[PDB]
Structures are given as C-alpha cells and as structure tokens.
Design an enzyme around this catalytic site. Structure first.
Site, mmCIF file in Angstrom:
data_model
loop_
_atom_site.group_PDB
_atom_site.id
_atom_site.type_symbol
_atom_site.label_atom_id
_atom_site.label_comp_id
_atom_site.label_asym_id
_atom_site.label_seq_id
_atom_site.Cartn_x
_atom_site.Cartn_y
_atom_site.Cartn_z
ATOM 1 N N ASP A 143 0.865 -1.217 -0.008
ATOM 2 C CA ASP A 143 -0.100 0.132 -0.095
ATOM 3 C C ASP A 143 0.863 1.424 -0.087
ATOM 4 O O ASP A 143 0.546 2.296 0.676
ATOM 5 C CB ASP A 143 -0.758 0.031 1.269
ATOM 6 C CG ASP A 143 -2.060 0.650 0.874
ATOM 7 O OD1 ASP A 143 -2.415 1.612 -0.186
ATOM 8 O OD2 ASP A 143 -3.020 1.055 1.769
ATOM 9 N N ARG A 201 -0.030 9.334 0.058
ATOM 10 C CA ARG A 201 -0.810 9.632 1.203
ATOM 11 C C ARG A 201 -0.281 8.694 2.321
ATOM 12 O O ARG A 201 -0.665 8.916 3.591
ATOM 13 C CB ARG A 201 -2.367 9.067 0.853
ATOM 14 C CG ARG A 201 -2.685 7.468 0.870
ATOM 15 C CD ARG A 201 -3.780 7.163 0.409
ATOM 16 N NE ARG A 201 -3.807 6.001 0.028
ATOM 17 C CZ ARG A 201 -3.439 5.367 -1.164
ATOM 18 N NH1 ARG A 201 -3.246 6.233 -2.166
ATOM 19 N NH2 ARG A 201 -3.608 3.857 -1.435
ATOM 20 N N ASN A 202 0.446 7.687 1.998
ATOM 21 C CA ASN A 202 0.899 6.763 3.257
ATOM 22 C C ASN A 202 2.372 6.830 3.538
ATOM 23 O O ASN A 202 3.144 5.983 4.029
ATOM 24 C CB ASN A 202 0.866 5.139 2.756
ATOM 25 C CG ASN A 202 -0.451 4.826 2.993
ATOM 26 O OD1 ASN A 202 -1.531 5.468 3.624
ATOM 27 N ND2 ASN A 202 -1.087 3.768 2.294
ATOM 28 N N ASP A 211 1.287 3.216 7.517
ATOM 29 C CA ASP A 211 0.088 2.100 6.943
ATOM 30 C C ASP A 211 0.349 0.877 6.642
ATOM 31 O O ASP A 211 0.828 0.522 5.451
ATOM 32 C CB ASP A 211 -0.548 2.770 5.998
ATOM 33 C CG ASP A 211 -2.165 2.310 5.799
ATOM 34 O OD1 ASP A 211 -2.324 0.977 6.194
ATOM 35 O OD2 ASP A 211 -3.000 2.756 4.792
HETATM 36 C C1 LIG Z 1 -2.919 12.069 4.103
HETATM 37 C C2 LIG Z 1 -3.802 12.346 5.164
HETATM 38 C C3 LIG Z 1 -3.168 12.583 6.368
HETATM 39 O O1 LIG Z 1 -2.015 11.702 6.878
HETATM 40 N N1 LIG Z 1 -3.098 13.809 7.299
HETATM 41 C C4 LIG Z 1 -2.629 14.314 8.448
HETATM 42 C C5 LIG Z 1 -2.767 15.504 8.730
HETATM 43 C C6 LIG Z 1 -2.058 16.102 9.887
HETATM 44 C C7 LIG Z 1 -1.207 15.511 10.623
HETATM 45 O O2 LIG Z 1 -0.397 15.707 11.693
HETATM 46 C C8 LIG Z 1 -0.887 16.951 12.536
HETATM 47 C C9 LIG Z 1 -1.062 14.095 10.286
HETATM 48 N N2 LIG Z 1 -0.088 13.233 11.328
HETATM 49 C C10 LIG Z 1 -0.279 11.712 11.611
HETATM 50 N N3 LIG Z 1 0.601 11.374 12.290
HETATM 51 C C11 LIG Z 1 0.695 9.878 12.577
HETATM 52 C C12 LIG Z 1 -0.218 9.386 11.960
HETATM 53 CL CL1 LIG Z 1 -0.191 7.510 12.183
HETATM 54 C C13 LIG Z 1 -1.147 9.889 10.753
HETATM 55 C C14 LIG Z 1 -2.064 8.870 10.092
HETATM 56 C C15 LIG Z 1 -2.164 7.854 9.657
HETATM 57 N N4 LIG Z 1 -3.260 7.404 9.046
HETATM 58 C C16 LIG Z 1 -3.989 8.566 8.906
HETATM 59 C C17 LIG Z 1 -5.066 8.754 8.131
HETATM 60 C C18 LIG Z 1 -5.900 9.868 8.441
HETATM 61 C C19 LIG Z 1 -5.058 11.163 8.663
HETATM 62 C C20 LIG Z 1 -3.840 10.756 9.687
HETATM 63 C C21 LIG Z 1 -3.342 9.529 9.698
HETATM 64 N N5 LIG Z 1 -1.042 11.139 10.684
HETATM 65 C C22 LIG Z 1 -1.446 13.508 9.184
#
Ligand SMILES: CCC(=O)Nc1ccc(OC)c(Nc2ncc(Cl)c(-c3c[nH]c4ccccc34)n2)c1
Ligand code: NA
Length: 306
Positions: free
Chosen positions: A145, A149-150, A163
């Site tokens: 995957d 986005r990941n 992911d």
């Molecule tokens: C592409 C969309 C995206 O990742 N947005 C996003 C926005 C702002 C953030 O920080 C302030 C982060 N930080 C973050 N830190 C750890 C994880 Cl493990 C994930 C994460 C894993 N799977 C996800 C699914 C949806 C949203 C977040 C995650 N995200 C992520």
C-alpha cells in the site's frame, strides 16, 4: 528451500489508556479514525505527541484482528524512514499509538506547498522513501500500500512510511505473497498484482514509481478520470502515466522502469536509493521547476541486503 525462521523477539508494549488524552481528529473515513494526542508516561517528566489509530470494520472482532496484525508488523520494524509503534492500548476496539508526524502526509503536503517545493526536496524524499522500502525488503515485508498518502512528514527534510494494514511477512526464501479477496488500491498496484493477486518486493517497486509520479506532479491523482476497472487493460495495452512537466527523461525513465511488465526488470530499492541520491547532488539537472531554490556515493546510500 533449506533456511528456517528466526524467532521474532519484538516487545509488544501495552499502554494504559489513562496515560494519554485525545486532542483532535486528524482524519477518518472507511478505514477508521486517527486522533492527534499527547502521551504522558506515569513516573516521568515527559510529554510525547502521538497519533492514535482506531480502525473500523463491520464488527469489533474484524477490526481487532486487522489492527493486531498491523501492530505485529509495526512492532517488528525499526528504521528512521519507517513509522514505529510506541505501543497499543486495549480499548474495546484496540488503539495503535505511534509518533505524531506534525506536517501530515506527503500527498497533502506537496498539494498545499506546490509553489514552494524545489527539486532538492522532491529528490531527497524519493531517496528517503526508497531507504524505507529497502529496509522493509530486508525485513522480508511486502508493504502492498505504498502511496504518497501513506508517506508521513516529520519535517520537510524527514519523511517516514506508514500504514501497514496490508503488509505481509514473507518466509525465509519465499518470493511471493498470494492474496485472497480484499480491496486494494488498483491505481498503485502492479499488473501481476491486479491480474493474479501476486505481491512481491518488485510489486512494491511499481507502487513506488507511482508514488514518485504523485510527488513530481505535485500531488495529481494517477489516471485521473479513469475508473479502476479499466486500469489493467490500459496497462496491458502498454499505456503508462504521462511524463510530468518538471521531469527530465532521466527521471521519467526511472518511473517507466518501475512499471515494466517484467517484475525482475524493475529496479531494486537499493538501486533507486543510489540513482536518486546521485540526482540529488545536482537537482536542477534532473527536475526543471519554476522558482527553484562525481559518481561518488556515500556508504550510507550504498545498501547491501542484510
Ligand atoms: C494524508 C492524510 C494525512 O495523513 N493527514 C495528516 C494531517 C495532519 C497530521 O498531523 C498533525 C498528520 N499526522 C499523522 N501522524 C501519525 C499518523 Cl499515524 C497519521 C495518520 C495515519 N493514517 C492517517 C489517516 C488519516 C489522517 C492521519 C493519519 N497522521 C496526518
Ligand atoms: Na542517476
């Protein structure tokens, strides 16, 4: 076919639910929900920003199965370019706790900062993602995957792969993972994965090429407008993603090699590390971007299977 398996002595850390508080939702959809949070271990003068992942499926046993399989993999990996499990939390549906990546996913990042993203960043991201995948390959993990986005952004200079919901561990001398039914993002998948559900380290390389394409187009959707059912016949016909405007033939050729029909003709991740890091020494020779900013390779970019 003689190598056996070594024991996996990774420690699974179980965290008290009371030791951390949610702060806000970062994202949610079909997969489940991710929260921003703060973790405060009991006998310590420390506060750690974390992401709290609550996966959602048809039933609780279904979610808990999937989420514990993911914890297994993440607890078994330790690399600067791969996200690390801090632990799990045994709520009704289990929570996966990991490091908060304050700048979000790389896909949204390149979309939001399109105008202030130079060649040096793009190329180093490619190096760093390849280092991550190569490590995963050395752990005999197929990610399945990989996509922009990941890839998460700790800092603009430091990205990590996330992911592991679809990740699979191969046996000692095992080459392929044959999948059962199950949704997988068709537009990042190698042709053999679509046709035969065969996943290998070389099918991950296909996904990497698509991920690099996402970056080089500043976050365009691959095969935009085309339905997923039509993708395999498109690829069978020899058609591929188009050359991004900022890309030289040198960079586009690397993507095309990742999308070869012959999986073993695709580059290895160790080769991609080398190629992209050479390019990163002279970024503007390889990417031609509006408003931008010896054959010698450092040993840390010359990785040998472990
Ligand atoms: C592409 C969309 C995206 O990742 N947005 C996003 C926005 C702002 C953030 O920080 C302030 C982060 N930080 C973050 N830190 C750890 C994880 Cl493990 C994930 C994460 C894993 N799977 C996800 C699914 C949806 C949203 C977040 C995650 N995200 C992520
Ligand atoms: Na090169």
């Amino acid at each position: 076919g003689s190598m056996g398996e070594a024991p996996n002595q990774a420690l699974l850390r179980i965290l008290k639910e009371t030791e951390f508080k949610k702060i806000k939702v970062l994202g949610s959809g079909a997969f489940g929900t991710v929260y921003k949070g703060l973790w405060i271990p009991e006998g310590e003068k420390v506060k750690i920003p974390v992401a709290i992942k609550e996966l959602r499926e048809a039933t609780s046993p279904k979610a808990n199965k999937e989420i514990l399989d993911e914890a297994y993999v993440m607890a078994s990996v330790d690399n600067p370019h791969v996200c690390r499990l801090l632990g799990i939390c045994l709520t009704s549906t289990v929570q996966l706790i990991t490091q908060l990546m304050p700048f979000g996913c790389l896909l949204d990042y390149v979309r939001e900062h399109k105008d202030n993203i130079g060649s040096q960043y793009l190329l180093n991201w490619c190096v760093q993602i390849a280092k991550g995948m190569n490590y995963l390959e050395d752990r005999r993990l197929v990610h399945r995957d990989l996509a922009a986005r990941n890839v998460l952004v700790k800092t603009p200079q430091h990205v990590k792969i996330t992911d592991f919901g679809l990740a699979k561990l191969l046996g000692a001398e095992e080459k392929e993972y044959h999948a059962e039914g199950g949704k997988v993002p068709i537009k990042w998948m190698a042709l053999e994965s679509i046709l035969h559900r065969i996943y290998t380290h070389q099918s991950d390389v296909w996904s990497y090429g698509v991920t690099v394409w996402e970056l080089m187009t500043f976050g365009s959707k691959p095969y935009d407008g085309i339905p997923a059912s039509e993708i395999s016949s498109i690829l069978e016909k020899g058609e591929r993603l188009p050359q991004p405007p900022i890309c030289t033939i040198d960079v586009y050729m690397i993507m095309v090699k990742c999308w070869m029909i012959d999986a073993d003709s695709r580059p290895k991740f160790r080769e991609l590390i080398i190629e992209f890091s050479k390019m990163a020494r002279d970024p503007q020779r390889y990417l031609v971007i509006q408003g931008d900013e010896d054959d010698v390779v450092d040993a840390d970019e010359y990785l040998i299977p472990q």
